[PDB]
Design a protein around this ligand. Structure first.
Ligand SMILES: CNC(=O)c1n[nH]c2ccccc12
Length: 162
């Protein structure tokens, strides 16, 4: 069902993550981590302390789809087991590492979210956005509910964290 998802998403904040390649979304799905540029990592760290949940929604560029979404379970931190991200630029330019819990690892095509606009990007369709763009509450919730259920995920332990 979708009740515990709705509960997780309640009063959440959402941010559009854009990846240049599939390999980085695969590493994120395998290791439960994300790293970004410091201008974005600064935005996420502030959002993490302010919201019950901070939801990242991933799209690989030129893929035409979102690849799922995840919930931040920490602020960024430095000095961890390094992550072999594929970069255009290398290594140091990325800030710290965020720990994330995946809520949906399935894909959603842009064609299915064309009725959702994002007021914080001039009401352009929610698929339109720079890496790190915030998605307003109502658009962001409805977008997450469009994803096919990911039956391999149990939101009980995610709820145990907020
Ligand atoms: C795993 N994180 C990234 O691949 C990433 N995040 N922000 C960026 C900006 C330019 C290029 C790559 C990135």
């Amino acid at each position: 069902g979708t009740s515990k998802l709705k509960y997780v998403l309640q009063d959440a904040r959402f941010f559009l993550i854009k990846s240049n390649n599939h390999e980085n979304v695969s590493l994120a799905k395998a290791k439960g981590v994300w790293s970004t540029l410091p201008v974005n990592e600064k935005k996420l760290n502030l959002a993490f302390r302010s919201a019950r949940s901070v939801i990242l929604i991933f799209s690989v560029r030129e893929s035409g789809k979102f690849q799922g979404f995840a919930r931040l379970s920490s602020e960024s931190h430095h000095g961890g087991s390094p992550i072999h991200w594929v970069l255009p630029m290398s290594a140091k330019m990325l800030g710290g590492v965020f720990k994330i819990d995946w809520i949906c690892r399935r894909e959603l095509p842009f064609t299915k979210s064309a009725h959702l606009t994002n007021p914080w990007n001039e009401h352009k369709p929610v698929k339109i956005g720079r890496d790190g763009q915030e998605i307003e509450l109502e658009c962001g919730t409805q977008l997450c509910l469009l994803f096919p259920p990911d039956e391999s995920i149990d939101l009980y332990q995610v709820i145990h964290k907020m």
